[model samples]
Target: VTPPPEKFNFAEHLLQTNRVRPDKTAFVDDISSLSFAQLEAQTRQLAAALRAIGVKREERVLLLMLDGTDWPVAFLGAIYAGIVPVAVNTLLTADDYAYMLEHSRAQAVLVSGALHPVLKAALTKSDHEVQRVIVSRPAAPLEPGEVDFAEFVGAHAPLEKPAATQADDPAFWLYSSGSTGRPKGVVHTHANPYWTSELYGRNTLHLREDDVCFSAAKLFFAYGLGNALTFPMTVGATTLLMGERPTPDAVFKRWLGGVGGVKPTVFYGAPTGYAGMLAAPNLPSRDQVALRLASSAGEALPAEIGQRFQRHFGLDIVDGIGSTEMLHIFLSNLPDRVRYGTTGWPVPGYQIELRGDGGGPVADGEPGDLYIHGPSSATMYWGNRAKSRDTFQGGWTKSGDKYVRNDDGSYTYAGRTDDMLKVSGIYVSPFEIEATLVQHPGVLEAAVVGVADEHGLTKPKAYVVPRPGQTLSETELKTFIKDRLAPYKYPRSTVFVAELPKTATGKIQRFKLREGVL
Candidate 1:
């Protein structure tokens, strides 16, 4: 049964699951399978540990762990104790973790043994010191003053109930995936997850206990936490978890190597993942798989890529656009009705508007910045009141995405507000240029950014990543686009790159390309 919207306790959900189906698997990783009963038991045990270790309500707890089942154990445990969990990407460098530690001012830190090297290095000369040092699944022995996860749990009795919290109380803080620049912290309340569970998980996806969910996105990202953890758990459905990065080879190997006898009913991946999987020597047939549905988000899904994937896999890729600000997907394409180029209608319970600077709605055929108002959306970016005001105004979260609403009720992604290139006084969407380049057989992926010329005139510049062993000449790519796209849409300069600079989630960092970083 779906819980009431006002009650957003994650701990309560596990307890309720234990009451109903104790033996049902909550999550199954490659090595471990935790039933609802075990999950509840573990959750409470960890909650008690957090509470006992001086983690107060609303204080941030940093999670620097791998994509193991232990991730959720630490995350939900904090929320159960009314402490907000900051889930950082496990594979980031020491510098990245240091930046987050100072930015978040986290009081408690939970880490995995696999990341000990980076974590220990980042901890040196750290600005923010934690009250407790709980390490989970450490490969080696712990140092002095460190609390082993196993030892922390044994002494404390299971916390049956979470700390009493208001619906609007802070639940967790999400960081921007940092494709464009530095990652910023976005604070979300319990109400945010509660509503996403209602609107996206329950209403849009129609999740059920019988469905087994699998996602390539790791738990550190907002999209990952929703796909692999939050959404699946909302319905008592089992989630297939993985510790490795979701590269094409890793994904296929893990998907084919199911957790014991369980076959996933639902598959979720970002667009980059789908592209990488397609680049493999051979595409796997759906006949050998058990997925009933597949979904994509995190970036725009190219029509050519989606079509090829559908033709080969016999399943449509439901492409959508989402960000950390909203906690989950507010705009999405339905599984039954797929639109290759356009991100489909807004999900239920959210309102989306394409507006100009004045907040007035844009013309149907015109592109403008997109703004969202969802119950699940984060209200502010942490520690920056000015930016929070600029981003969240009048209850609407600015998406920073440019979109054109068609007369057919669908929205097409133009590009980001900053991502648009102005050439000869005309604004051009980099996505249009990049999309055209990607259609070429030699071009595996592409990015377009405005590079300033000697006269300080901004012109379109392309950075193309070619398929392995394929050669793509600048003249050949330029001529290819000039033949297909409008004369003005052609890139003046095209540079071939072995690989595009991307974030942990595989989003191209265009700004770096503009600065001439290869």
Candidate 2:
């Protein structure tokens, strides 16, 4: 059963539940399986170790570790120790890592042996005082000057639980992809996790104790973190933590046999991952290993992919649009209430409205920019106060997405407002056309951008990457799209590209593609 909204603190809830269900399995990873009791004990010991090393209330601590059994323990330990944990993407380039560490003013960084070089480079370039550099793996001792994670925790005496923090106190920080510019750090408070549970947890999906939840996206992304960790733990459901990088093959292999004899009850992944999974052979039968619910996020989920997944797996792949600024999913379909080709209703506690370019609400059913206001929203971007204010103007956070809301409350996604093209005096959404184009067998990935034509009108131009070993002819591809969509929506020109530019989090950089064409 979902807990009342007032009683939501991850640290407190985990600690109390562990005491009651001491022997229940809490985490399963390649390294080891830990019970709730053991996890609680380890977290307390780790918290004591961090406190002994001068980590105090409200201090910023950078977690540079990968997804594993240790990751959650370290994260919860920081919360218990009254320190806020900022998770940095392990896949980021060295320069990207340096910028985040410097900008967040992190006092300490926790990393594993595999990430030593990245941490070292970030430290060398950063101006912040990195009081301690802790390593997760003790076998490979931290170089002469650094501290070993296990050794430090083992050496210190466990500290008493700290005083309770207010709901508004900063609890965590996650950086956005910042495809428009430099990445921005989004700050959240203790109320965020609780509010997310109430909005997305109690109201939408029912997470039972028997559910084995898994998400293909990593914890570094806000969507993955909330779905894979906070959502499941908040409700006492078991979560499978696979530290390996997400690939279609890996996901298939893991789910085929099932994890610990429990089939995944809920599966979450991006559209790209879903597309790859659908392309695999024997998918219809292999998909039945066990899945009650499947969800897609990060990028728009294609309608064809959604239908194919439902037909093959006997499950619906409900797609939702969420952002880092909102902290968790705001618009999603409940398992029982999915729309075939549209994002579902607004989550409870969130108010969503379509705003025109002039910053006023648009007429019902008219396409416009999406604006959302809710309690789970982030407080501010770490250092970009000006941009933060602009983003959160009029008390609503601009989502940068364009959509049309139907009378039934379902939302059909239009392209990004910034990416829309005006062709022959009519605005066209590239997403609608691109979704239709991706159904073609030869096209592996498709990106559409607005390019000026001979008549000086902006028309949709497509850039496509062909499937492996398949040659793409622009004429053939254009004919394929022409058969499916309206003449105006068809690509005026098509280019076969090696690959599309993508952000660190794997989102396509459409603006970059437009710049290239210009």
Candidate 3:
């Protein structure tokens, strides 16, 4: 694929690409749909509107909207006007928003009507002041400094032109989560999205113009940003967005043409979501849905989940490895040929490396640190020089993951560097134990973490969730794992639970389990 021009605006590029089909539907959300024409007009209007309120070029705006038609308008509008938008997670607390507002030094906030109360709470706690608060679909009367989204757009005519931004110019920010410490603001550029769309979305997934897309991941996440926004727009496809949580029933409803009388052909989700949907008694049969392909990320998908999904749906859950820092998937399983137990090969435009502690390549079978060299990587962690230096080094971004490459040329996830446990003077992967535990017939899911024993020695402990109406004993689970893996690799203790604590993207929060927070 060719590179983006030095002077390129992502929003403008998408609008220009879809202009051929002005009346085509670009997005369908919980409450409304946006035509390509409407998207362009409203996006440009929002741009002029933001500028009318004194929010200038390169100034920060907090994007705290729920997934919907307005989200794309809000996100792209800022970039069109050369403003930087910090898209934050909707599930965070008021304190998190306060810190983000202060850190981003955002001049404005574009939020959903349902989230206004939290923004109010956060503003009260924050010393930083914003110039404007644009609310979408307000449930009640707006406060001073806040304006209705429709009114905000209607007040200004559409801007005739987009900002002249370089490909490398800061376009947006998405905070990257870590096991500990405050989240880091990962700043991505205009070209980053372009490269990801071209390499993974267009080339790897082979998205078509007639396809309708939906993602369990929301727009704020890098994965979702690619899945729902950039990827679809790149190929002039339609996307379905939801403001509510992506429950099994919610996803199934969309699949069966329950919402907007549309069925998605391309779906994006996490492994946990696949497991939940597969285990649901009401799962639609193969003929009930129109899914041609599905994508999985956020965490490693177990082989069993992929296999069962294929058996039921006759579709492959094309798993991949991506991060907030890299913008989108660089290593992925192809839609045509999928290996259930691996993350597949690197995209044509990207490079992957597995290095030992000495920073040299490791043997194919040995676990090593993962690093990626790709064009879509973030410029830096905003305002975090130390972390920026550590992660984005010498044209390679250090992935905090460990992986093993097989002789057959596929890569298998080991675990995160910080999450890897050393037991009995040998390296142990909690992911290995967790993956094995979930293979039992009674097991639905499991998360493994290292716990200190009475002697202060580290050992693997598993927190498992049994299949509904199924009973499991620690002894029975241990024996099941011992037969498959080395004896020492089995979890020393197993605690059966109803569910595992997870992030918004469905990654099991092992840190929470390690901290004894259930």
**Highest lDDT model number:** 3
Report the lDDT of model 1 for residue 366.
94
For residues 1-518, could you state the per-residue lDDT of candidate 3 as single tens digits?
99999999988999999999999899998679999999999999999999989988888999999999999999999999999999988876687899899989999999999899989899999987688999999987899768999999989999889999999999999987554457789999999999999999999999989999999989998889999999999999999998888889999999998887789999998776788798799999988999999999876777888988998888889999887899999888999988977999888899999989999989989999899999999999989999899899899999888999988888998777766565532345677677777788899998889876643445788898999877788878766876676655667788888889999999988779989987
Using lDDT as the yardstick, the better of models 2 and 3 is 3
In candidate 1, what are the lDDT values of residues 1-518, reduced to their tens digit?
34445656765654665468789888888788888788777878988888887778888989888887777888888888888899887756687788788888888789988887778788785787677778888888898888887678776888867878777778888776322345679888877776777788777878888888888877877777887788878787888888876677776765665465677878888665676687788556677677778888766777777887888888888877776788888888888888878999998788999998787878898999998987777878888787788788888888778999888788998767656554533346687777789999999999988775543445688888888877778877777876676565678788887788999999998778866787
User: Each model's RMSD to truth, in Å?
Assistant: 9.9, 9.7, 10.0
* Better candidate by lDDT, 1 or 2: 1
- The residue-by-residue lDDT of candidate 2 on 1-518, one tens digit each, is 24334434456655774476677667666567667777788788888888888878888888988777788777888887778889867766567778887887787888877887877888887776678888887445567668877787678666576437776778888886532456688888777877786678646777666677788877767777777777777666667777777777778655764455545678888766777778877454733577787877866566777877888777888787777888888998778888866898898788898988787778778998898998878888888889899777766888878999988978987766555554432335677667867887888988888776542335788888888887668888867765566565778888887788988998989888889842
lDDT of each: 0.78, 0.75, 0.88
Cα TM-score per model: 0.81, 0.80, 0.83
Per-candidate clash tally:
0, 0, 0
Candidate 1 vs candidate 3: the TM-score winner is 3
Lowest summed lDDT over 10 consecutive residues: which window, candidate 2? 1-10
Scanning candidate 3 in windows of ten residues, the lowest lDDT window is 419-428
Clashing pairs in 2: none
For candidate 2, the C-alpha RMSD (Å) to the true structure equals 9.7
